[PDB]
Amino acid sequence: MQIFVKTLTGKTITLEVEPSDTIENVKAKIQDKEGIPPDQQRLIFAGKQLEDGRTLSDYNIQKESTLHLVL
Amino acid sequence: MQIFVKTLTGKTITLEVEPSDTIENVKAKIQDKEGIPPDQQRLIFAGKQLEDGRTLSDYNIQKESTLHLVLRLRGG
Amino acid sequence: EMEPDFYCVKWIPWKGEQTPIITQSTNGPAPLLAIMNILFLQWKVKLPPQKEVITSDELMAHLGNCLLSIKPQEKSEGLQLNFQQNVDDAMTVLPKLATGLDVNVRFTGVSDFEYTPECSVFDLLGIPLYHGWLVDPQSPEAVRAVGKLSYNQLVERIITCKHSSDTNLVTEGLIAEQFLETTAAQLTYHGLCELTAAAKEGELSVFFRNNHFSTMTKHKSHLYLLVTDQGFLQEEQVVWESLHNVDGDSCFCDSDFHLSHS
């Protein structure tokens, strides 16, 4: 499954993920691609912050979805 | 006795109970294994939503019986 | 910010004036913020200039005062018990606004919910409550199996169908289960089209989507959602998020609906 992460700088990150992946897993995967520590990452989908301890599935995130990444 | 609870997700919770237990009591036990609020939980067995004050015995819920947990849509 | 009934106030240049909107850090107060942000954008409630932090108690106090001051549409010396009923049922649900509000969507219209005490809060304030979880008429499978059923009816119907002898019902079960799974983010393309057309230009409204409530408006035939996540607290020019697709691929806009850059 592929999703997109848009920063405010205007940059688009592509990730390969599963619905069962945790927000913690997704932040690890963003560290891989841009070397940004998970603790400096806040993920948002459709205006609501995605918290650690829940899965992509928990937030109904399907393939080709765009998340927003902020400090 | 031991009962099963099927979410729409597909996973299944096992509970220890007595025919004398209230539905409120089973929602309370579900709040542990899965962390869900009782007032969001709806329990279905043989076509009926289970009322809080009723007992397992009131709905003839025997050992190994399967209940269905469906959630209210809650906006947070 | 950190403690659970504290919110950061964000001041924005709205229509000539520094205007507060409340930001959210954790899940639970979206329904309260969706209403309170409308009252703040309409200047129906005012905060001391550059107040930085507000509590649940303060927001509830302001909202309570607004609800109790609504007058009935038709003025009469007596009766108006139906109106008085709405107000008391609105005052009883008020506290759930901070922790989470139950809704029961029907998939037939952007304004279609089961009428419940929870709905009353928006009705009494004259605030429209919308949703774009609409079954596409060009999927007549879904239209026939989903029907006029509310969400609450449909998940029960799915359970019944799975245990049916009748293969017609088993099949209805599968189509409805498949509707819920493919539209799990609670917004369809058809919903988005119908919502864009039904919403009133310049009007502020509450939008339920993906177990969340947003403040919504329409500018130049386009839908926008107020940005409330505290991660944008410092971004003055990030105020509105475009709603023109179902996959979250949005543009940020300033107070005046002009594209913002970082």
Residue numbers in the entry:
A (entry chain H): 1 to 71
B (entry chain D): 1 to 76
C (entry chain A): 108 to 369
Which sentences did the original study use to describe this structure?
MINDY1 and MINDY2 are members of the MINDY family of deubiquitinases (DUBs) that have exquisite specificity for cleaving K48-polyUb, yet we have a poor understanding of their catalytic mechanism. Here, we analyze the crystal structures of MINDY1 and MINDY2 alone and in complex with monoUb, di-, and penta-K48-polyUb, identifying 5 distinct Ub binding sites in the catalytic domain that explain how these DUBs sense both Ub chain length and linkage type to cleave K48-polyUb chains. The activity of MINDY1/2 is inhibited by the Cys-loop, and we find that substrate interaction relieves autoinhibition to activate these DUBs. We also find that MINDY1/2 use a non-canonical catalytic triad composed of Cys-His-Thr.
To understand the structural basis for the specific cleavage of K48-linked chains by MINDY1, we determined the crystal structures of catalytically dead mutants of MINDY1cat and MINDY2cat bound to K48-linked diUb, MINDY1C137A:K48-Ub2, and MINDY2C266A:K48-Ub2, respectively. The crystal structure of MINDY1C137A:K48-Ub2 complex reveals how MINDY1cat has extensive interactions with both the proximal Ub (Ubprox) and distal Ub (Ubdist) to precisely position the scissile bond across the catalytic site. Ubdist binds to the S1 site in MINDY1 with a buried surface area of only ∼750 Å2, a binding interface much smaller than those of other DUBs such as HAUSP/USP7 (1,700 Å2), USP21 (1,700 Å2), or USP2 (1,900 Å2), which rely more on Ubdist binding for activity (Hu et al., 2002; Renatus et al., 2006; Ye et al., 2011). Indeed, Ubprox has a slightly larger binding interface compared to Ubdist and binds with a buried surface area of ∼965 Å2. The I44 patch on Ubdist primarily contacts I266 on MINDY1, and further interactions with Ubdist are mediated by V210, W240, Y258, and F315, which form a binding pocket for L73 of Ubdist. The I44 patch of Ubprox mainly contacts F339 on MINDY1. The binding of Ubprox at the S1′ site is further supported by additional cation-π interactions between Ubprox F45 and MINDY1 R316, hydrogen bonds between the side chains of N317 and Ubprox N60 and the backbone of Y59, and ionic interactions between Ubprox R42 and MINDY1 D336. Comparing the structures of the MINDY1C137A:K48-Ub2 complex with MINDY1apo does not show any large-scale conformational changes induced within the catalytic domain upon Ub binding (RMSD 1 Å over 244 aligned Cα atoms). The only significant change is in the Cys loop that undergoes significant remodeling, during which several hydrogen bonds are broken, accompanied by the formation of new bonds. In the active state observed in the MINDY1C137A: K48-Ub2 complex, N134 and the catalytic H319 both form hydrogen bonds with K48 and Q131 interacts with the isopeptide bond.
